[PDB]
């Protein structure tokens, strides 16, 4: 083929409920107007998005993409386009392939969509049980992907959970539970941080321990 198709340097990061754009471009930077533009996941057909002869082909698109996909083409005349996916969900996470065809010449590349959701303000439950020992449970809802839990003393010394749980909701978002047993007098405050590693964003909650 007298052209190549280049995908992005890195994964595209997309927040749940927002739109994402999956770009691919021709090399050299020649017009892509009128080419077959196909985005797909596992099977070439049915596709995430299909344009032929400058028209979207809806009947050749997966039913779960129909009506939420569209071609971004501000820059099509120089070979640069994208598929906009509206209202991103957790199931949209993964590898996509972008295929460009003019008659007998075709080429393709890979775009990675990485989906993220940031969950609720964490909460700590305190329960004093068996003689002086304190059990804390930290809870938060709605993270994607699996979020990280970090416990810290007021000084900043991290320590691990005793146990942890993650359970996806109906839309695939994780609820996280983590428990720790505090064995100390001198622990003034303890905090729990829940972090989405993909966004590099966290939330925390501090609690206060009685003598």
UniProtKB/Swiss-Prot annotation:
Residues 1-211 are extracellular. Residues 1-114, 122-208 form the Ig-like V-type domain. Seems to associate with xanthine dehydrogenase/oxidase. May function in the secretion of milk-fat droplets. May act as a specific membrane-associated receptor for the association of cytoplasmic droplets with the apical plasma membrane. Inhibits the proliferation of CD4 and CD8 T-cells activated by anti-CD3 antibodies, T-cell metabolism and IL2 and IFNG secretion. Expressed in mammary tissue. Glycans are attached at residues 29, 189. This is Butyrophilin subfamily 1 member A1. Belongs to the immunoglobulin superfamily. BTN/MOG family. Disulfide bonds join 24-98, 138-192.
């Amino acid at each position: 083929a007298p052209f190549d198709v280049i995908g992005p340097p890195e994964p595209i990061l997309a927040v749940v409920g927002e739109d994402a754009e999956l770009p691919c471009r021709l090399s050299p930077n020649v017009s892509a107007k009128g080419m077959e533009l196909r985005w797909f996941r596992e099977k070439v057909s049915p596709a995430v998005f299909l344009s032929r002869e400058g028209q979207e082909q809806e009947g050749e698109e997966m039913a779960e993409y129909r009506g939420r996909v569209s071609l971004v083409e501000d820059h099509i005349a120089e070979g640069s386009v994208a598929v906009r996916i509206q209202e991103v969900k957790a199931s949209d996470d993964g590898e996509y392939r972008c295929f460009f065809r003019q008659d007998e010449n075709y080429e393709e590349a890979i775009v990675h969509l990485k989906v993220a959701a940031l969950g609720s303000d964490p909460h700590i439950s305190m329960k004093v049980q068996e003689s002086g020992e304190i059990q804390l449970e930290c809870t938060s809802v709605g993270w994607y992907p699996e979020p990280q839990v970090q416990w810290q003393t007021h000084r900043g010394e991290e320590f691990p959970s005793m146990s942890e749980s993650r359970n996806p909701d109906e839309e695939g978002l994780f609820t996280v539970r983590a428990s720790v047993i505090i064995r100390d007098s001198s622990m003034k405050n303890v905090s729990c941080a829940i972090r989405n590693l993909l966004l590099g964003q966290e939330k925390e909650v501090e609690v206060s321990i009685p003598a």
